Design a protein around this ligand. Sequence first.
Ligand SMILES: COc1ccc2c(=O)c(C)c(-c3cncc(-c4ccc(OC(F)(F)F)cc4)c3)[nH]c2c1
Lengths: 74, 378, 46, 415, 59, 196, 239, 99, 445, 65
Amino acid sequence: RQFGHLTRVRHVITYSLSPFEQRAFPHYFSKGIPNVLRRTRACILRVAPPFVAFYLVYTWGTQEFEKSKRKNPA
Amino acid sequence: TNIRKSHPLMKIVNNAFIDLPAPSNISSWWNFGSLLGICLILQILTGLFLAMHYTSDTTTAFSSVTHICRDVNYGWIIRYMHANGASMFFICLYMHVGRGLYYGSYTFLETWNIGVILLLTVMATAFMGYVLPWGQMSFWGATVITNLLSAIPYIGTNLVEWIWGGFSVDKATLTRFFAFHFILPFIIMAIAMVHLLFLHETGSNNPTGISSDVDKIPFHPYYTIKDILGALLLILALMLLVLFAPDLLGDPDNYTPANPLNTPPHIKPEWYFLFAYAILRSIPNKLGGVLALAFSILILALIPLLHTSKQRSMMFRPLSQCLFWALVADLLTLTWIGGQPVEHPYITIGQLASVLYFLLILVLMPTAGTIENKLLKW
Amino acid sequence: AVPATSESPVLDLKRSVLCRESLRGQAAGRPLVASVSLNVPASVRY
Amino acid sequence: HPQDLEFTRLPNGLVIASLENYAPASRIGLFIKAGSRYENSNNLGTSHLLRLASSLTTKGASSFKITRGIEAVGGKLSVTSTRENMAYTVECLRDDVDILMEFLLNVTTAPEFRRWEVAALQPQLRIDKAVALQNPQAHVIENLHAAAYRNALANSLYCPDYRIGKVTPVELHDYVQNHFTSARMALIGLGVSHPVLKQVAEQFLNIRGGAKAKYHGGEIREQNGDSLVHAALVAESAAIGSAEANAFSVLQHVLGAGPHVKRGSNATSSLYQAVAKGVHQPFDVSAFNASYSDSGLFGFYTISQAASAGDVIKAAYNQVKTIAQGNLSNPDVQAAKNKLKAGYLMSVESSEGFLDEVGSQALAAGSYTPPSTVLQQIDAVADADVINAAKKFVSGRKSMAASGNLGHTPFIDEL
Amino acid sequence: APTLTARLYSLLFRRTSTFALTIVVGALFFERAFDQGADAIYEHINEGKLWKHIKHKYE
Amino acid sequence: SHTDIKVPDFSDYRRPEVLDSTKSSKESSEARKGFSYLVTATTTVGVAYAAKNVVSQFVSSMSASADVLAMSKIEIKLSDIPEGKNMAFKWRGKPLFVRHRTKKEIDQEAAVEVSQLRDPQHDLERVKKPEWVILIGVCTHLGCVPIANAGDFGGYYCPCHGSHYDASGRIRKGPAPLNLEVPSYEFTSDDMVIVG
Amino acid sequence: DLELHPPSYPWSHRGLLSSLDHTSIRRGFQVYKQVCSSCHSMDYVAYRHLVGVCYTEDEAKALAEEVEVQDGPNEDGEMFMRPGKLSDYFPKPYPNPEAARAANNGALPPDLSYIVRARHGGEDYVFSLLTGYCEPPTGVSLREGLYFNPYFPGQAIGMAPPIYNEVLEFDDGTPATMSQVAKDVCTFLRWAAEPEHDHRKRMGLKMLLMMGLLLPLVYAMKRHKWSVLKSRKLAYRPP
Amino acid sequence: RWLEGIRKWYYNAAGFNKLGLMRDDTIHENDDVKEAIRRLPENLYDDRVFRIKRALDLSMRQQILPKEQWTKYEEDKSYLEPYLKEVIRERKEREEWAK
Amino acid sequence: ATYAQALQSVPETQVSQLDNGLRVASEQSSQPTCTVGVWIDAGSRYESEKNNGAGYFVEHLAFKGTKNRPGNALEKEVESMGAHLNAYSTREHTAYYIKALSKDLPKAVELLADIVQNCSLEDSQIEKERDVILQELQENDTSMRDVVFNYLHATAFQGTPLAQSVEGPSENVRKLSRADLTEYLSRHYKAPRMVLAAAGGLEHRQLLDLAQKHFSGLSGTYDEETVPTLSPCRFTGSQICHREDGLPLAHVAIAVEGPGWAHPDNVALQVANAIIGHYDCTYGGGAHLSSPLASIAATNKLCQSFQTFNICYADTGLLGAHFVCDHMSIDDMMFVLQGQWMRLCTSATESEVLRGKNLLRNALVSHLDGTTPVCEDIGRSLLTYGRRIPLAEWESRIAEVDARVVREVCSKYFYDQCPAVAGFGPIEQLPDYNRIRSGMFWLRF
Amino acid sequence: LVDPLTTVREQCEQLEKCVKARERLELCDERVSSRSQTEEDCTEELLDFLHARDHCVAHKLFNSL
Ligand SMILES: COc1ccc2c(=O)c(C)c(-c3cncc(-c4ccc(OC(F)(F)F)cc4)c3)[nH]c2c1
């Protein structure tokens, strides 16, 4: 479906500037850094805990394989 | 009126690549489609240029691949571009599928199923590609994996010897593996066009899982400029491997020629199969192991039926998000475990991981959807 | 050569009238005339 | 060299009139007795198609050349229809008059009306009419005439819907061949010499020749659910050229014939104040005066809210009754004359409107009456003549037309 | 006096013919500059290790 | 009313040059375009540098590999072949005849009839030094290896069909169309020759 | 079956942009020549490969001429032996693997062309192997011929300690200690397995710089085009 | 009753409210929902259109609204329920009749 | 009697000035009717945000009485002498004029003077005309043309007084007291900002003396603090899209920054705009029209109507086009329109520029027909240019334009420049600003 | 001729991690060499020692080359 046949919209105004009138990086660090920390804080304890568990099951299983190959004092 | 909408060839290009209405809000996870296309073209070129110097005879094969890397001008950079390009393909593929799972793009059933076929074909291609150098892991990998089909009752043993064209992986096997490996990418090319042909019936999903018809932007320039940037970052990843770590994702044992006596210590496929290799080894019975390895990929075709949430994307769905990232972490565990020897504690961890894989897809993520619904009074 | 006071389109919604001050001048006083051209928009007069 | 109008009537009937004023621009108008009135029930809307049909291919010039050639030199070709006349008009800078004149003669004296071009043009009848009928004055005035007459003036300027797609090439040829003739034509000019116009008219406009309007009195009522009701009520008036017609024109300006001040309350308009006394919600009223060769219509046009249409029309009609009964002072009739006198001179102020009056007169009368003589004829209208015009309207058989939600619009016999 | 970017626009970037010629010229000048400059950085980083640096000992 | 609509303030987003609402942006328009198109132009020069190198390498691949260039040329020692005798060599999977020619063989092949030959070539343009003639030992008609110091014309003779070559390698009497082929070569130091 | 993996020695080519020490390669070749080449083959390296790396054209021609090699047939139909040239590969010790086993008590000496690439640890591994030979610990003994090396898998190898102090004199007069001889031969075996190394890293540098330039430029082009949408303000104005 | 504490928590965790969306804006459009949407009155439809457009625009920038402007849990009107309920109730009637 | 000659003997425009600074300008001819009026450098551009729409509010009150003629006395006197009284307000120019019998010019000038200077502005009359303006503001919402042009200005000259509408926001209309209106008047209605223009049958000498008699009291001094100078207005490359699918046809208005009144380039730009020209669905020409945009539009039924404009303000303006089309035609209209701008920039021909010249020659010679448009040309030209420019001078500027000029002049304003876009209605198809902006250049020239 | 290797191997041998591992090595040396008939050996203890030793050797052997 081409533009002109997508959907019905009414009473919605959109203002915008030319890209030659404006900056590529407005407040890039000023507002970017806090928005990143907000986004990171928001997803951290959905994303991270499984990978912490992988790190633990990995480092546990690796050095358990090393101990198992050593002799037992008997 | 213009000669972009009028001319039969430009019409197709204008509607599928320029004036294509795309959602305003699609994220970086939507770039992997175009990057898979770039990977496919990249493999075909590098591949074709390698095929100008390679030979599929068992005696000369390993030597031809080294002759490429030593004597052919820039044959090394082509060779290792092609090998790491296969890794870049699979990275791109799993990211692309994960996007589909998380954001529920799989509701586009036809697009999704053709996807599954594409995945399976790129696997078949890359399995047979790794055999062509005719090193140890090539030869021994091909031997063990092919011979899994002997586990089928009645016919299995015949089937395996018919693939081989003989009683082991030898002269007739390598030559046909070169022929099939050449033709399949072109078949992928065609199936990928059918893939998009279905995608353009619905247009793209977006991160919200909510219809974007009220906020469509033309593909050009917005996503043509993003795809350039994406391609640039794909080439960085590729060339970082080719120029600073060409052997990192391969194996040393594929630099000794194939020896039918001398077995390598811990024979394994390339990193992107290790998850499914681990699932195979979890199950003690061999036929059961093959049916689990088969179901570990084909379960992708089941995913759409298992959808229970009244919301499409996982964006607004915390339980599912966690279970999804558990499923990813589990696959990372299966890849780790797949690369290990069959011993304690890698057997038990592998079993536990393999149960968790199927448990997450068939039981927990469906339940989570229904719980989320009842939390919203739905 | 000169464009008309009003560009004419078909199927375009009419301009509403909400007061005396805009409605005066409309009451017809003389019989109709119809002009058509090459360059100027078509008009209908009182 | 200050210049005045020249005038000629050839023995074949055709009138040439031309003021050489040495302006940069040159207006030429070929006026023809070929308005909608000369249609019958078999070829209705033929003159409408004919009006749209200039710039179709002619014998001496293609459809392409008429458009491109005229545009090339910055020019204009217009075609204007009343009920009684058609007027083909060309403008340009004075150096390109003989190029435009050649096109004008081709259009009027030798059109081909090719089957494929004529057929291709049929949808334009629908578009042109559709546009025109956006103005509700067009509905009402076209219906008013249709109600008021049995035959010629009843005809609409626009082609009836059923005829659209069915006006034939033969009908267009017939219409031109029977109406575009020397005895029915006047060639008017500004910024061109009279002798060269005369010689064009002798050499290219000598072409051989080819019923009275019965007043009826009726009503037509367009029910359409608008919140405003347009309505016109008229009676048979007087033929243009007669002295009685001047009395109606003065009565028109006594009663009120459209606005003088922007956003003004119309303090001198007798109708507007008569209506505004009773009803203060949005409305408009004006005296309506059409005047033709055979006949005329005089009355008034209301625009009112649906519910108040009854009150507005009766109020307006009552105002004419007091004028007809004798309530009419000199200061009103003097003011009304000053309006009419000023309006006429202002209408011929531009060289567009001047051309229209020169050609208009040339068909309906023998020759040109100058502005000073017209103003003297307005002054000749006595207060007695105005009261007679009003009296004629009150006792005259009425014609009416309305459009809107007519639930409270009265019929003629409710008035 | 107009700014540097403005001089670049009016002289080189406005006509697409000059814009293209500019890129092709710039690419030649860039190629040799970048190659020569990057090779210097490489060979300084590996001073005395390359055949180029030890060539003179056997000629 | 639509007159109530007022366009939002874009000051946070605007470029410095167009912040001042009381000044004309036309001064800065030349500049603002310049900046953005410089970025585009610089990018294209970078991509050109890349694509040139990428394409050029791929093209280089198809040109002769290092092992094929290794067999391209062959060194021959001129003091190891005595005056009169032929010496055969292996060159690009072919025989390669080098021949030290005597005072007699030089002068006898110098004053030969130019027209009588089937392939007219004079001797001083078939060789670079008069006393050395280097030839491919492939008989031109249907491919054999000619035997040295034999034939009627005292040079090379083939027992396959019936060809007779002179001491300069030119066909004299037989079915061969072309003469024996003169390869590309150059003498380095006076004792050595590289063919190829 | 315990395992001791090698430590990471600070090689002169360890870093991202660090090239091979070509003087170390020149020594390392001589350690293959003088010591290994009677036991190990190195089939993929020819005498021409040395040119423009560790030796000149003329030096490499001398090294090639020193060795015997079979060629044929001649017109008689016989296989003769001739002095080598640049086109010849490094000559195999034995005619075949079965012959090689007999000369080394069953064990086959692997080809060294790719041994750095074909073993985990690479040059770190080989250096540790060559210098790590020691007397066995108490409770241990292997078959007569299998020596003890702590870095070899399974703790026992069938190679006699090949290097020691002054096992050869180097052409540039470097004191040939066991550690020096191992370091040099490893540097050569690194190059043997990966000739591209130096070009590869030169390319790496040029890629890193081009990306340092293009990524932020293309990212700026992206932000420029997208600034129309990122700035935009929306308003809902229902009647 | 007792799980109303968890419902309130989950609502904010889900976080569609941070884009000024109501729950019924996030519902996945199947054929029933499409029909239910199609039956909305001018006002409810155009508000839906805007709310989504605003969310999509926020999503594009990877930003959220100010906390004042977030959809309150209590004020989340279930605007689509009565239309969707009947669309489904209708379909099940046809499906019954078809057997 | 040729065209070049005709221009030489067109009546000259007389020019005199009063002590206070009021300019009296006159074109005379033996005509029984005349038009006379006052043109003022006043409008929305001179208004701040807190008093926007004051000049429009005044316009409503101007003809509703004076101190000398209270209420409908002013109205009655105009009507009873057959005179026609009229006003208009633009962003830079307010104007009141009267069409009258030539013999009644003294009274005409007297009445104009009474309106301007002694305007009643009654309490009750203000509160009545308050609701009237609110209903006009509502009528104006139904005119998509009016709305889209107000939007073009609003976005084009955003954050300046040129962004403001003439009528003002309804908030101001509802609150403006009579104190605001009288303050607005005494600041802006000053003799040096004003012109008394007249055309028809009238001796210039008599008009000057009539101006003395009635407009002498007009103030033409400014106090030490403040004097109404217009600041320049920043054009912004911007877009405003009011999406409303419930309407049947889409209005689009697009333009680049024009040069403004004084600049000679305006003549070449008029010629270029004449080439592209204008069209609507009632035009007889269709496919055979000379303008490629019009012939393409007609044959493919792209739009219902379009015109090119060139709107001039002091140090800036709006140069472009407006069109009205089907919701599926907006992309194609824009493509062909922008395509014409590029073709004129890069590759305009001599014969088509000759056509454009001839159109423009005809345009402004036939526009000055009747006393009212001539009076208006006198009034405004004195404000914009500082003088009336005779037809002979326009002709000289027009003959100077050849194909090379049209290229160079169009390339200055159109080629690779950021436009302002306004769309209203079913504008889903309306191209993205980047696609519009990229359509302001060709990858060839 | 003295090898830089054997010098540094001694230097590294006298660190806490080496000498503690060397005592572990010597413990089982005179446990298995004193006891009769047990198939236990001392490979593990040697490898613990070498891992710690040769890690240190690596850190500064290449200085002398
Ligand atoms: C929602 O986004 C969509 C929608 C539809 C499509 C679609 O139909 C197709 C065919 C692709 C696609 C597939 N393969 C390769 C490319 C490609 C090739 C070269 C490029 O140039 C560059 F790398 F920049 F140099 C850039 C992209 C694009 N991508 C899509 C993305």
